[PDB]
């Protein structure tokens, strides 16, 4: 379902799966997508998150605190959570409603906030970033 | 959305198990090759078994090239950049052939198109040239 994803939006997902692999996690969840948005660095999502004071180490530290330690020999298959798949689907639906034929980093962050009830949304409101503020930051940076 | 088939998924699982068995710190192309043979049922397995590429023949050649590590890794094992390139080429191969899935046959095709890692070195040393492995897969399809 990544047909209209931009090269940097594709990069976001790649970094997400590499974070889940490094952190010894069994799924690619919404919080790994959030980490990938920050890791990408250059897109509208990364700039928006930086203007809100959301750092890579703060999200990663909050994620390890919630999930905890895993197995010594986990299964090598790391699929998306159903919640992360819904975020990706809502990313497409957000960009379609805006009249865009592409899906960039800003649409993935918007879709993440739209779902707004997983690990990523939980880590965001813990780091002092209410979800409605993240959306307005993304929208106001897309205006100019 | 995931394009990898169930058996291609099983190959990746076995590849991580195989690297941990050898106390290796990466999932390389040679562990992907061992996952193809370990899976057994797919097209890639039946092909390699035709060219005379046994499961112990590859494990033996891997031991001579790299050998056992000192400590067994814990958690997930990262892919080599070369193994990531193999998986990327497996997708490009399936797209060029007009398929929407990534099966074991596309993983072996992407493995030989990269053709410059431990797996490619092992295959040649076992007597199977890279172009001959490619055709045993294509005519089987």
């Amino acid at each position: 379902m990544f047909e209209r994803f931009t090269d940097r939006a594709r990069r976001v997902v790649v970094l997400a799966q590499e974070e889940a692999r490094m952190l010894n996690h069994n799924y690619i969840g919404t919080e790994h997508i959030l980490l990938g948005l920050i890791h990408e660095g250059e897109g509208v999502a990364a700039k928006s998150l930086e203007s809100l004071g959301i750092s890579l180490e703060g999200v990663r530290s909050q994620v390890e605190e919630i999930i905890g330690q895993g197995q010594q020999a986990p299964s090598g298959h790391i699929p998306f959570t159903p919640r992360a798949k819904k975020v990706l689907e809502l990313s497409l639906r957000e960009a379609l409603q805006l009249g865009h034929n592409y899906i960039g980093t800003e649409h993935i962050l918007l879709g993440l906030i739209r779902e707004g009830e997983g690990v990523a949304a939980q880590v965001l409101v813990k780091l002092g970033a209410e979800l409605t503020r993240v959306r307005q930051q993304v929208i106001q940076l897309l205006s100019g | 959305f995931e394009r990898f088939t169930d058996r291609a998924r099983r190959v990746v699982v076995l590849a991580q198990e195989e690297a941990r068995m050898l106390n290796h710190n990466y999932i390389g192309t040679e562990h992907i090759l061992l996952g193809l043979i370990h899976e057994g049922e797919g097209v890639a397995a039946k092909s390699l078994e035709s060219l005379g590429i046994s499961l112990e023949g590859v494990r033996s050649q891997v031991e001579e090239i790299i050998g056992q590590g000192q400590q067994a890794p814990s958690g997930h094992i990262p892919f080599t950049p070369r193994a990531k390139k193999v998986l990327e080429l497996s997708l490009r191969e399936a797209l060029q052939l007009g398929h929407n899935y990534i099966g074991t046959e596309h993983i072996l095709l992407g493995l030989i198109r990269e053709g410059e890692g431990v797996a490619a070195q092992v295959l040649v040393k076992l007597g199977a040239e890279l172009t001959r492995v490619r055709q045993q897969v294509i005519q089987l399809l």
Binding site: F2, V14, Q17, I78 | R3, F4, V12, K84, S90, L91
Partner: peptide, 5 residues
């Protein structure tokens, strides 16, 4: 698992 290198 996504595979875009």
């Amino acid at each position: 698992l996504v595979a875009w290198g």
